């Protein structure tokens, strides 16, 4: 007996069990990768539970610093990996596009761990990375867990964050955390954010198909089905009455984009909430007509325009 | 219609579509894993085609060295990963065990890349640890390659290689080149080997049962199948006439290990041509009462003591 069934991708049933068929590839470590012109990365721990993919585009000169852009995936808090080829495919040419050092993170999933184990997953790869800023590689001398490319290479002053779907919601969960518990204990600021076709569930006037008014919605219950408020909880109803303040959120710059489907009315109104709180610094919408999927499609010319257009907001 | 059908774990079609029973579960990386009280692993490139999990045990003093081990998993030269959970939970064990570091190759499998691309692949991840000799911490602001846990803990006077089956061919094969490519060009010696259960073709006397005479032979021909001389090519009979001599292998200590079954005849040919060669160093035989699957089953007496024995080689 199933309570979740959504084909291939994910089988749930009564006693527990899960099932997952038809997810991408594993796709090992590689160094100079010749697809890309050079990306290289590597799997790195940052707890027992936690890890990252760690990416380093072609380095021109060893004395050179660059963007880091912490990465959290998308697919329903229950789908796919860092470690994948359908998320990790993107982060490799957006890499490449930003000339960025990037940190996939590997966050537990649901339902065997229900939320908020990936907020806080992503919110300790976070942390790790910032806890690298002022050491030098004679740091690598007694902590085994620190990373020499994120030594060598990373510019505090342009960290950011990238998140699509529920990756995205993951991204608004931190950026509020970020105002109310600061990175490091405020040695680290988060410059920018991305927020791609993010996932909140937010009433709207328009009357919505069954897929979005069941299915759609039905990967927060899957998520934490325990939230306090159900799809009205804060961390997925960003409006809701009792909602931390968008004002609070610990960046200066956000990329907000959407698609032309029927998850745009949602996004209208978190925008609204945005401007309305009177958060202080820029906020750039990428308003695509486009479909979401046509995003990760990673060679075809769509992929790459709607790619290089977020990428762009990487400085 | 299948070229191979290989029960119940390979078909190859004639079409070249290759079918593999579902494998183990890949296992991410993590730090301090409490099962093991404390072993850590990443997964890192050694070049575009080759990567390696590595391997650290709990670290009690900043400054001790630490054996090492470079290991190449077995499962037919055409199954399985150092990331899966069958070998993993296995090198993670004889990492505690042992207290080395451990480097666990993931070359390319057959029939996809037929060999000899998993001996080369095994080849450049030896010379890539063997390359960390005599470096410092520093190396690593300019080497992206380089490993940090390689510089601090490795003892290059303590190098081991370990296989199982077709892993332990690829030992076999990599010992006798490093007779003559000597690591780093020859700043490293190897001092240890351990060989499980050798995939070797060596003819018997008599002739054996069906599966050792017929479907335990195909995964040469499905591995390599234009080798020169077939199943007697020298990587796979170490005793053909035109084969390499077995005294020339590139290290000082060998741990020949076998298991009560039909396996140990050839195995015991094989002895008898590396003692009948007059190599010059330590030979130790681990001949088990028990049956080849009963080393990986790694929450039973029996595989703690199986692993036990052939751990305790590493010295």
New interface residues.
Partial sequence: ETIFDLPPYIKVFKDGRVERLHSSP?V???????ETGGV??????????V?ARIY?PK?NN?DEKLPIIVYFHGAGFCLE?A?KSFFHTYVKHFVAEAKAIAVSV?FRLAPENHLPAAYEDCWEALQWVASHVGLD??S???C??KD??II?YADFDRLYLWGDSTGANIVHNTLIRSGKEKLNGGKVKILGAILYYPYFLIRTSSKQSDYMENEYRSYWKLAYPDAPGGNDNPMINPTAENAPDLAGYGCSRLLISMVADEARDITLLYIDALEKSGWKGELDVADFDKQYFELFEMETEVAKNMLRRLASFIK
Avoid: G
Avoid at 28 to 34: K, M, R
Avoid at 40 to 49: A, G
């Fill in positions: 594993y090992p470590p590689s160094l100079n990768d010749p290289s990365w590597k799997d790195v721990p940052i707890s027992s539970v890890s380093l380095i060893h990996s470690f590997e590689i004679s690598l001398k007694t085994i867990d020499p490319w060598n």
